Structures are given as C-alpha cells and as structure tokens.
Design a protein around this ligand. Structure first.
Ligand SMILES: [K+]
Ligand SMILES: [K+]
Ligand SMILES: [K+]
Ligand SMILES: [Mg+2]
Lengths: 161, 119, 31, 54, 90, 111, 167, 75
RNA sequence: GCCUAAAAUAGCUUAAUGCGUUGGAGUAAGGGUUAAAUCUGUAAAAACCUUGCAGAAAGCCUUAAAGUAAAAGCAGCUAUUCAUGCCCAUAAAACAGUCUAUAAACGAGAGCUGCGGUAGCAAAACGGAUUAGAUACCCGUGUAGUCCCAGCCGUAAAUUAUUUAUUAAAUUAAAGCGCCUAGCGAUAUU
C-alpha cells in the first residue's frame, strides 16, 4: 500500500522491467505507465507521446503485494480514492470550528438523540436541547449552524448547535 | 445479590398496576431486603401478540424494579408472578454487585495521596 | 485390525447367535 | 494499608446512594404513585442506562 | 460507509431492553450476523446473541420479519416525534 | 521500538501513503523523521517529570510527545498535500446537492 | 432524605451472598488458632484444616443431591490427598503432626506399616489392636468383599470412618 | 417473509429479488436439511464434502485472479 | 469481581408439524413412482382464512470444539446449588512424587421391569409394485422403541499406550507395567 520509486531497466514490445530496489525485478505492461508518473528523467530531451517512458527514468509505483507466486514484487499504477475528498472537507470543517464560522447544513430526518443534518456527505447530530423547533421543522433547506465539537477523523462525529 | 425484574402486565388502570407492584415490594421487604429503583414505561406495542387460551394481547404495560435481597427471593418473586393473573410475562436477571472494581478504587486512592505528597 | 479380519470373524458370530436363539425355547439345549 | 483505604472509600460512596433507598411501605407507596404518574420512554426509541451495581 | 459502534459503546449498551441498539447486528430479514461481519470480540459476540434471544422470549423482538406487524415502523416514528417534542418543550 | 507509532501517523495523515520513498537509501522521509523524534522525546519527557509517591496507570497510557510533534510537523505535511491531486471544495459539493434537489422537485411537480 | 447506614452494612455483609461464600468465610475464621501468623494461608496446618472443614460441610450437601457425581469425584480426590500429606508429616515432623490430630480430633492411623507389617505404628503393649490394616493389605480375601453400589453409598462410609466428629 | 414490489410491470425483476433473498437469508439451506434425516455422524461427512467443493472453487479462481492482476487479461 | 457448549435442580418462550378439532368460503381431486397401484376424498377432502388441544425438538448466532467434561460427552432462555476458568492482590522453615499387583467407581446406542406420556420418525407386521424368483432395495399403513421418573444390564471400529529430560514435532536414553510367540479349531471343564 506504500508508493515507492522504481527505475526503468528494459522496455520490450510486450513488457517493461522495473527495479524496486528491494529484490528481484518486477514486470509491468508496456503501455501501462505514462509520462505523468515520472519524477526524475535520465535526459532532458522532450518526450512526444503520453506513453513514452524511456529506460533509466524514475517512476512512482504502488506496491500491491510483497510476496507473489511468480516470485517478484507486484507493482501497480497509483490510483485515487474518495477518502481524500472527505478528508479535505473535514479539514475545512475543523478550520471553521477554530475560526467560529457559520456552517450551512440541510436537515434530512429525525434521530433518536436529535436531528440528522448533512454537511457535504457528513451527517451531524443536532440535539433537541439546542433547537427552537423552527429550524427542526425546516427540512431540506440550508440553514446556518455553529459547530461545537467534533471527534477524531475516523469516528466522523460532529455536534451542531 | 442485586436483581432486576421486568414485568409485562395487561394495559389496565393505575390502581391495578400499583397493586401488582406493591405485592413484589412487600415480598422483598418481608424477606429482609430493600428496593433501589422503581420505574414505569406505560403501554407499549409488542413485536408480536401474546396469546392466552381465548384472548389476544397486542400491547402491554411495562414496569421495572431493582432490589437487593438474599438468594431465596427469586423463587418467592416467581411464585407471585405466576399467581397474579394481571401479569403476562416476566423475567428476573442478576446484576453485578459493585459499580467500581478494587483496582479502580486503588487508583483513586493513589492519585489522592500523590496530590497530598506533592502539596 | 483389517477389513478382511473383521469379515472372517463375522461369519462365526452369526452362526453362534443363530444357534442360541434356537435353544432359547427348548427343554433340552442342543450342545 | 491502601486496600483498607479503598474499602473506606467504597463505604463513603454507598452512604450517599442510600439517601434514595426505600425500606418502609410508606415510601414504597409514594414511589409507586410517582412512577406511574411520570412514565418514561422504553428502549424502542432511546437507549436506556443499564444498571451496573451499587 | 456504514455507522459502526465502538466496543466501549457495545459493552455499555448491550442489553435486551435496548432493541433499537441491538438492531445494528441483525440482517434485514432479522437474523443474527456472524462475528466476521459484526467485527466484535468473542465475549461481545456472545452478549449480543444472548440479548437478542432474551428479547425474543419477552416479545420485544420477532424471530423473523412478520407481515402482520409492518405498521410498527410508522408507530415507532410517531412515538419518537412526540417524545422529542415533549422533552424540547420541557 | 519505533515501529509502533507509524499506525497512528498514517491514520491521522493518510497523505503520507502517497510520497514515494527510495527503499535503498540512507535518507529518511518525513514519516521516518517523525518516528525518530517520537522515540527521542518520549524518553525525555518521561525522565523530566516530577516524581510522586505512587505510580498511576493513567500516566503510563498517555503520550503528550505525539501531540507536540504533530503540531510541529503540521505545516510540512501541508506542502505534501498540495503536491497531490486537487479535490472539489465544500461550496462546490453544496451546489451539486442543490441542483439534484431541484431536479427531484421538478420530477415531483411533473408527476 | 437521610442516609441509611444500617442498609449499607447489610449489603457489605455476608447476608446477601450465596451459601458457598458464607461457608468459606467461616472456614477461614476457624483456622485463626493454628495459623502461623496473621496472613498464613498456605502452611500445612492451615491446608489440612481447610480440607477437613470442606468435607464436613459437604456431607449434608450430597445427602439431598445424590446425582451430582462430578462434585463427589472432586471430593474423593481431595480425600486421598489429605491422607498422604498427613503420612509425610508423621514420618518427618511429628510435633506438627500431633497438633493437627489434636486440634481436629482425628486418630493416629497415618503410618506406613509396609509389606511385612500387620498392625499400625505407635501401638503400645497396653493399647488395643484392630483389623483396619489387615483389610487394606490383604484386600483380596472374600471375607472383606462387598456388593456393587453407587458412589455415595461407598464413599460416605469411608469418609465417616476417618473423621470421628461427624454424627 | 420477503416482500418484492413490482415496478412498471417488470415481474422478472421481482422474481430475481426473491431468489436473492432465499440464497442470502438461508431459505434453501433449511429446505435441504429437512428433506430427509441424517445421523450426526453422517451430517458431518456431508458438511465436509460441501466445504471441500467450496474450497476447490476458491482455489481455481485464486489462480485466475493472479493471472489477471499480472498480465492484465480482459476476461 | 466477572465468565462458562460443566453437572444437578426448578420455572418460562414457539417457528413448524399432527388431528374421529370449531366457524366461514369453495369443488374434484389429493398422495406417490423408472412407470403404476394400494391408500385418503367427492356422503364435501387437499388448497385458503380462522378456533381449540397435544408431544417432541431447539433456525440465524455456530466454528473448530479453540470446553477438553477423566472418558462416555457438551450450545433455546432465566434463576438456584455447586465445580471450574480468567484478571488484580496475596501465602507456605521442615509436609505433597511416578507407576499399578490387588480393589473400587463412572460409563453411548440397543435391550429388560414398573409408572406416566405418545405429535413426528420407525424394527416387527399387513397390503401395492419390481423381478426368472424379490422371501430385499421402491410406495402406503404401522406396533414395540425413541420421551419422563425409579431400578437392572456393563457391552462398541468405547480417541493417540503412561511418566522424566530434550524437541515445533521428531529423535536419543531411562523408570514402572500389560500384552504377542505360524495359522486353524469348544456354548469343553471350573
Ligand atoms: K449403555
Ligand atoms: K460402535
Ligand atoms: K509379536
Ligand atoms: Mg454403576
């Protein structure tokens, strides 16, 4: 699951060889990599095609596995995950709490402890003790709220006032 | 030990419910115990209906009582529930004796002494 | 013990059981 | 020595709890009447605090 | 992503009376989920199973989905609304 | 001894899983620098603590060194995040929700 | 409302506790005279006394519940272990052996006569002799045989024949 | 009791859901057990055979998955 | 202080199934096979909605057993009695061993005697088929038995021989036993 730097050794018609620097050489499809994964170039000569990686370059790869039945490391192109999108939103919410900013949320339904308020994919808790019964009645319309407390990123708990 | 009784009774009037609760309470007091908590939840709708030879009860009145008494009290309470016909279903469960363990008490004592020692 | 050994004993046990039942209801047991 | 202090600490806490304990029938009748006049919610809606002991 | 309760919450609220809480460990058909799905320790797995079985004996839970009790969801929401309003007014 | 703090470090800052590391090198990446600092300061804080009559288990299960280093390394990790792919902002997400709400209302109005 | 101290004392006391806990509390108090010091719970004097008290409390228990075979087997194992402990004490430390016998009201029958012996040890010319050892040694004789029975019917007789303080 | 609502007259879609409920919620397993009685010693052997078949299938597709991951085979 | 597929004791829950079961509605089949038939119905069955009564068993959790209960064995819920196992904190100046000649206890399923119960299943038995024959396999009925309490019987393809040191195992060397000496052949005698 960790990204490592590998050096291109051979580039054949079918397969390309990469050196992870740990043990036996790894194999990758010829056209799997692109010029956007290069961090260090052997030479400064401009490249023409997107799938133009020359031997000697250093590329970023993702370690899918360490032990494989073939006997070599498994390396795959890095990919994306929405978890970062939520993390970026969470950081923004934390900054708003520090700066005492007003957050906009939409009430979805009623909850045991209070009311459920959604904030860009995060469902917060609004205890009835801090509601005027007018905001509670308004469902599906954005309203201003003040963030009071929040849990650690894994827990994903927010309390609104 | 410490026991808790959950009773499902017919949705009758308050006087009938009070009488059923009082019977259990006096049984505990007579044996030499005491009662800690008395609570009622009103009439509740059940997951499925309780059936008697010619009656169906889709709802019941629920109350709970917590008491401390000798180990012989369980049989006495069970007998009272069976005899009374206003009670539909009951259960008695034993609870832990103490809220705080010996380790927790020692930690509190040590913390207090450290504050005194620092002072 | 093998399956062959079990089968060799099986026949003799059957014969003994059959004879005992026959003598179960007789005045003079045949022996 | 510390264990003896712990025992005394437990005794002190139980005294405070004993203020709300009932051992007479007169108090039992009052508690029953108050409980019936102020019903509470069951576990179908709100989680209940489970007793852990005295 | 689905909500998950902490092991501290489970040990504090694992009782047969808390039917709402116990519902998180039941399949949509109303059956008990295996430990490999609940992500619980062996002692906690046993407590949850016993709480559900005891609730069934007391008629607080049903062994399976029942067609004659499909209106309870409406009833529970109506009860929940009244309780929240009463406490808010108080 | 210093391989235990990595689990917490990656949990709080998942972006450290994107910075490529050269396995066959003597230079320590940001993640390894944090671990070494935690090991050094953890012993220092424990030693530089006034002694008391008794030892409390709550103190044994505390780690103020981790909090101090996290504050120190906060600005550095921010630069690493900037080097990664960009994501939609909070305002954009709310706008998308509003548009879908309007679409649902229009469908209801039609039917 | 005022605090009820009398209720706290009852709860902390042995009143609201299972029967086994109450019995065990009495056993420890009964060994306050022979223990070496205020915290001795493992000396041979204390261990043998506790085993003897457990046997006495178990006699009424199994007269009502005659089908709990698991408990009887545990009792039988402890019964044989106590005999071997007393046998060792007599051979190596007589003064400690004497105190235990006197305190618990037992009889001096814990010797090791051996193959060529026919009677118990420490028998003076004036003291009487019995056939307890002959039955144990020459147990194959038909005169000493009995009929098959239940565990309790066979164990209860042996338990009482060693403790003379049980009716 | 599984309830499958029919939308736009797509009866085939409802039938698919019913089969899924039976497999997921263990209705086919109950029917198989109650078809006839087997001793506990014979039921043990029956369970071993079923698990053995499941493990063989898992092994076979484990081999295929590795080929796809390495050679990027479009199967 | 808590836990327990441990044992004994006592209360409680019902998914399904059966019927010389109640009421409503409705009319020709239901059941079973390689293919058929016996059998149950049309004098109102099966199927459908309801009523009553009854016995046994414990879906998901649930997985080995990882409990090992000494072995035989053990998971529906709650409680009592009692015996274990876990944490935390203690204790012993002299005592505690291995193995078993002999002796005793526990001990699946089937079976026997008495008492209560009898839904489902099913030796025996009685019919319908298959086949050269079917005295079996298949189908329809179906009694003992399976269940509860008190006794008797002591038998299984009723687990890997026991112990010390080493060891992942293993291997190596010892301590105390039981059993075997080609097969075949007894209801011998006691
Ligand atoms: K037997
Ligand atoms: K057998
Ligand atoms: K031989
Ligand atoms: Mg016997």
């Amino acid at each position: 699951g960790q990204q490592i730097q590998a050096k291109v050794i051979q580039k054949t018609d079918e397969v390309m060889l990469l050196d992870p620097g740990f043990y036996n050489l790894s194999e990758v499809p010829v056209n799997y990599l692109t010029t956007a994964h290069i961090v260090r170039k052997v030479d400064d000569s401009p490249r023409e095609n997107l799938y133009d990686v020359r031997p000697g370059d250093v590329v970023k790869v993702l370690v899918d596995d360490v032990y494989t039945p073939y006997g070599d490391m498994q390396l795959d192109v890095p990919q994306q995950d929405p978890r970062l999108i939520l993390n970026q939103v969470w950081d923004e919410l934390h900054l708003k709490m520090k700066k005492k900013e007003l957050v906009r949320g939409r009430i979805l339904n009623e909850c045991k402890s209070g009311y459920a308020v959604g904030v860009a994919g995060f469902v917060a808790l609004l205890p009835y003790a801090n509601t005027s019964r007018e905001v509670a009645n308004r469902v599906g319309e954005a309203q201003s709220f003040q963030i009071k407390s929040m849990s650690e990123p894994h827990r994903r708990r927010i309390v609104l006032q | 030990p410490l026991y808790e009784l959950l009773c499902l009774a017919k949705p009758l009037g308050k006087a009938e419910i009070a009488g059923a609760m009082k019977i259990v309470g006096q049984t505990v007091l007579k044996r030499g115990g005491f009662i800690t908590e008395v609570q009622s939840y009103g009439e509740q709708q059940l997951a499925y209906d309780i059936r008697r030879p010619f009656e169906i009860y889709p709802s019941a009145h629920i109350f709970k009582m917590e008491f401390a008494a000798p180990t012989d009290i369980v049989r006495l309470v069970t007998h009272e529930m069976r005899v009374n016909e206003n009670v539909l279903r009951w259960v008695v469960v034993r609870r832990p004796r103490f809220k705080h363990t010996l380790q927790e008490l020692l930690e509190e004592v040590k913390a207090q002494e450290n504050d005194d020692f620092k002072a | 013990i093998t399956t062959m050994q079990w089968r060799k004993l099986k026949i003799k046990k059957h014969k003994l059981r059959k004879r005992r039942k026959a003598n179960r209801m007789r005045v003079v047991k045949v022996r | 020595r510390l264990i003896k202090k712990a025992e005394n600490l437990r005794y002190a806490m139980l005294l405070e709890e004993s203020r709300n304990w009932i051992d007479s029938e007169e108090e039992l009748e009052k508690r029953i009447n108050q409980s019936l006049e102020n019903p509470e919610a069951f576990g179908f809606i709100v989680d209940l605090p489970i007793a852990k002991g005295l | 992503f689905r909500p998950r309760s902490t092991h501290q919450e489970v040990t504090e609220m694992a009782d047969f009376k808390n039917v709402s809480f116990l519902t998180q460990f039941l399949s949509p058909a109303g059956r008990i989920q295996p430990r490999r799905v609940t992500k619980l320790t062996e002692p906690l797995q046993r407590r949850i199973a016993k709480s559900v079985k005891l609730a069934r004996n007391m008629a607080l839970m049903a062994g399976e989905a029942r067609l004659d009790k499909l209106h309870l969801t409406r009833v529970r929401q109506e009860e929940l609304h009244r309780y929240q309003l009463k406490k808010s007014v108080q | 001894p210093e391989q235990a703090v990595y689990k917490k470090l990656y949990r709080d800052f998942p972006e450290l899983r994107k910075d490529a590391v050269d396995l066959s090198s003597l230079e320590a990446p940001l993640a390894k620098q944090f671990a070494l600092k935690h090991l050094v300061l953890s012993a220092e804080i424990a030693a530089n603590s006034p002694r008391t009559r008794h030892i409390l288990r709550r103190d044994l299960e505390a780690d103020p060194a981790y909090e101090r280093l996290k504050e120190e390394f906060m600005p550095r990790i921010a630069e690493l995040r900037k080097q990664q792919e960009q994501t939609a902002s909070l305002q954009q997400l709310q706008a998308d929700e509003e548009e879908h709400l309007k679409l649902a209302l229009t469908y209801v109005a039609a039917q | 409302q005022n605090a009820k101290a009398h209720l706290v004392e009852k709860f902390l006391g042995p009143e609201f506790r299972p029967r086994i806990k109450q019995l065990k509390a009495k056993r420890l108090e009964a060994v306050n005279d022979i223990k070496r010091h205020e915290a001795d719970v493992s000396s041979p004097e204390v261990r043998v006394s506790l085993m003897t008290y457990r046997i006495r409390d178990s006699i009424p228990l199994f007269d009502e519940c005659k089908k709990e075979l698991t408990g009887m087997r545990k009792l039988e194992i402890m019964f044989n272990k106590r005999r071997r402990i007393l046998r060792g004490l007599r051979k190596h430390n007589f003064p400690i052996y004497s105190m235990i016998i006197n305190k618990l009201g037992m009889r001096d029958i814990y010797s090791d006569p051996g193959x060529x012996x026919x009677x118990x040890x420490x028998x003076x010319x004036x003291x009487x002799x019995x056939x307890x050892x002959x039955x144990x040694x020459x147990x194959x004789x038909x005169x000493x045989x009995x009929x098959x029975x239940x565990x309790x019917x066979x164990x209860x007789x042996x338990x009482x024949x060693x403790x003379x303080x049980x009716x | 009791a599984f309830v499958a609502e029919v939308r736009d007259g797509n009866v085939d879609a409802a039938l698919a859901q019913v089969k899924k409920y039976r497999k997921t919620e263990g209705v086919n397993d109950s029917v198989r057990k109650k078809e006839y009685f087997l001793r506990p010693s014979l039921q043990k052997f029956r369970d071993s055979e079923l698990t053995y078949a499941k493990n063989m299938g898992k092994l076979i597709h484990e081999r295929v998955n590795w080929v796809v991951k390495r050679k990027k085979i479009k199967l």
